[PDB]
Amino acid sequence: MSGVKVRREDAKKVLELLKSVGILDGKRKAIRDEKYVIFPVTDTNIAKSLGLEVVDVELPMRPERQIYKNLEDLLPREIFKKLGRLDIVGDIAIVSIPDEILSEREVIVSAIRKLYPKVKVIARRGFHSGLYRIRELEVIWGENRLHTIHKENGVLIKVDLSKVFFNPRMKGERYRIAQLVNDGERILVPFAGVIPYPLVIARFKNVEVYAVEINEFAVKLAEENLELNRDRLKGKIKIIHGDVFEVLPNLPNFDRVVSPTPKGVDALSLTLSKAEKFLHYYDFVHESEIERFRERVLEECRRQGKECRVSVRKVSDYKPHVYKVCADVEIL
RNA sequence: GGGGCGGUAGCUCAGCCUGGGAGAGCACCGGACUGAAGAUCCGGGUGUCGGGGGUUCAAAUCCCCCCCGCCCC
Numbered sequence: 001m002s003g004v005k006v007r008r009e010d011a012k013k014v015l016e017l018l019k020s021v022g023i024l025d026g027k028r029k030a031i032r033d034e035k036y037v038i039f040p041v042t043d044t045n046i047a048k049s050l051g052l053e054v055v056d057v058e059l060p061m062r063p064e065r066q067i068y069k070n071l072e073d074l075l076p077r078e079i080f081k082k083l084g085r086l087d088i089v090g091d092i093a094i095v096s097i098p099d100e101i102l103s104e105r106e107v108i109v110s111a112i113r114k115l116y117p118k119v120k121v122i123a124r125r126g127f128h129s130g131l132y133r134i135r136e137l138e139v140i141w142g143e144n145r146l147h148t149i150h151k152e153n154g155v156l157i158k159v160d161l162s163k164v165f166f167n168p169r170m171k172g173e174r175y176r177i178a179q180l181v182n183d184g185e186r187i188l189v190p191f192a193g194v195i196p197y198p199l200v201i202a203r204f205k206n207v208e209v210y211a212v213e214i215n216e217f218a219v220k221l222a223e224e225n226l227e228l229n230r231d232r233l234k235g236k237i238k239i240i241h242g243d244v245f246e247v248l249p250n251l252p253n254f255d256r257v258v259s260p261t262p263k264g265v266d267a268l269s270l271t272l273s274k275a276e277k278f279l280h281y282y283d284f285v286h287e288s289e290i291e292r293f294r295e296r297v298l299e300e301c302r303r304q305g306k307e308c309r310v311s312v313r314k315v316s317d318y319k320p321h322v323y324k325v326c327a328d329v330e331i332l
Numbered sequence: 333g334g335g336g337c338g339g340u341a342g343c344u345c346a347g348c349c350u351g352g353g354a355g356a357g358c359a360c361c362g363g364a365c366u367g368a369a370g371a372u373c374c375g376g377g378u379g380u381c382g383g384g385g386g387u388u389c390a391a392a393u394c395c396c397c398c399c400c401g402c403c404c405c
């Protein structure tokens with residue numbers, strides 16, 4: 001926290017060089033006079049290193065909203081070490097906190113609010129469980145509500161995390177499959193949830209896509225999503241309500257199939273039966289099993305009488321030594 | 333044509349009032365971690381601030397023009 005001096009016709013080069021040294025303090029604004037210009041600096045030693053005229057002076061604090069605050073920066077090392085990563089969905093700020101941190105948590109909510117001032121609700125985060133794959137959350141601050149529209153990849157998505165499942169992080173995957181699609185194709189997505197996958201797909205390609213859901217409330221929300229992104233989508237989507245295993249025999253075949261399988265569930269055979277060109281099957285695999293997992297996929301392809309090449313990518317970290325992964329049936 | 337707003341990383345966005353650090357979260361990539369975990373830990377910015385001009389020693393920030401998306405005549 002300090003500073004330096006420079007003639008008005010020279011100030012720029014001083015700024016750029018002092019920025020090369022990184023000594024230029026940024027948490028304070030700089031005073032300008034017709035005579036000279038005065039800049040703040042972090043360490044005066046390196047300032048006399050370059051010999052630039054350096055007078056210790058009082059320069060004004062920058063507005064808070066202009067300073068590069070950070071979650072690490074805004075918290076003590078202990079409470080930061082305890083707290084888990086921050087995930088924002090609409091205006092809901094979701095964060096893992098242990099109890100010991102929960103006692104000292106008001107500092108936490110202060111830090112979150114500082115980092116983002118539009119987050120109207122803040123909730124402690126638990127684990128996924130149950131048929132509907134919902135996540136456990138008990139609000140720590142704000143309006144006692146867990147439903148919002150959430151902008152992602154040019155798409156709007158309403159959610160009530162209390163009654164439905166959604167995870168923003170796999171948007172990358174949701175984008176990645178989207179550009180892998182081709183226009184005019186026919187794709188089926190079981191275990192849709194709301195429609196993050198076929199919405200983000202429909203936005204980017206002109207495609208008919210059918211979705212399957214048991215969670216009736218997730219069907220309600222998906223129905224709501226269809227209007228907003230119906231104005232916004234090139235493609236068209238059909239939402240069928242029911243169990244994947246009844247619907248899949250009773251529905252025709254599709255070019256592509258994308259199965260975000262619930263954990264502990266096997267739908268590889270059933271999905272491979274309906275897909276014509278490619279299938280994307282998501283499962284949870286331990287690192288050693290990945291290759292073996294590929295073998296498994298291949299085995300099913302042989303039973304299906306389908307000659308196809310398969311590859312597998314590590315979609316995300318599920319647990320210690322365990323990743324959520326995806327397989328890409330490429331049928332000939 | 334007119335005006336009201338928006339165009340910053342891959343997504344969602346701060347920053348602009350009042351000129352001087354390209355940032356946040358997640359994404360993405362590489363590494364690590366044995367019981368439950370749609371996690372967690374370590375490292376990395378991947379950028380034509382829509383474009384051009386003007387002003388100033390200096391523009392993401394102030395001015396004009398052009399392009400593109402929502403809303404009003």
Ligand SMILES: CSC[C@H]1O[C@@H](n2cnc3c(N)ncnc32)[C@H](O)[C@@H]1O
Nearest residue numbers: 132191193212213214215242243244
């Ligand atoms: C990762 S989200 C998995 C989604 O699939 C839905 N789901 C789980 N099992 C089935 C099933 N048999 N049929 C249709 N949807 C399902 C759940 O409601 C959840 O939202």
